[PDB]
Amino acid sequence: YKTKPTHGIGKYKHLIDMTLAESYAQYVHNLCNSLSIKVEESYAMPLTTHERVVQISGLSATFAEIFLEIIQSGVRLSVXXXXXXXXXXXXXXXX
């Protein structure tokens, strides 16, 4: 009841090659999860070629750098633009 000391006890609203590439993407996702970063989305973009994405948002420079290094440590990368090499992968950021 409103006037009772147990007022808002129920209140809840306020609380609320290709294969290889895929594997790599998965790994990246896992890493992100581990390190506590928001993985927003992932795509399945179209000899043959195959692209995968891991959309990321919010990470400080030092931490970000570390993450990048870990990713670096095959196929390719593309996010300052930071490309590298060993089908295709493209971890687009939003820091």
Partner: protein, 107 residues
């Protein structure tokens, strides 16, 4: 234009501490302003009723939805990792004991 609907007369029909016989309706509502607790049932209107002779009591009890009911589960999942939902429950605390052994005869 529009509609003018009559008052629905819903709400509590029996308050905490009232002596409520099996069958008495306790509280009527649309949606769950109260939930059924110990020895209290639910009709098709969501109306709460006493399943035994006894006294009505109200309590704020932790709420866990049924696994099969999806929306509630989703909500639960959404909540942060030390959160518990809580909800109000109406109980009947039974008075008279169901049984008494009496002496029929000496055989």
């Amino acid at each position: 234009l529009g509609g003018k609907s009559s008052g629905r007369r819903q709400g509590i029909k029996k308050m905490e501490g009232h002596y409520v016989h099996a069958g008495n309706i306790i509280a009527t509502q649309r949606h769950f302003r109260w939930h059924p607790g110990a020895h209290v049932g639910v009709g098709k209107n969501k109306c709460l009723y006493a399943l035994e002779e006894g006294i009505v009591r109200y309590t704020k009890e932790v709420y866990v939805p049924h696994p099969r009911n999806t929306e509630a589960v989703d909500l639960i999942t959404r909540l942060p990792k030390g959160a518990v939902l809580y909800k109000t429950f109406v109980h009947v605390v039974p008075a008279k004991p169901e049984g008494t052994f009496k002496l029929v005869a000496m055989l």
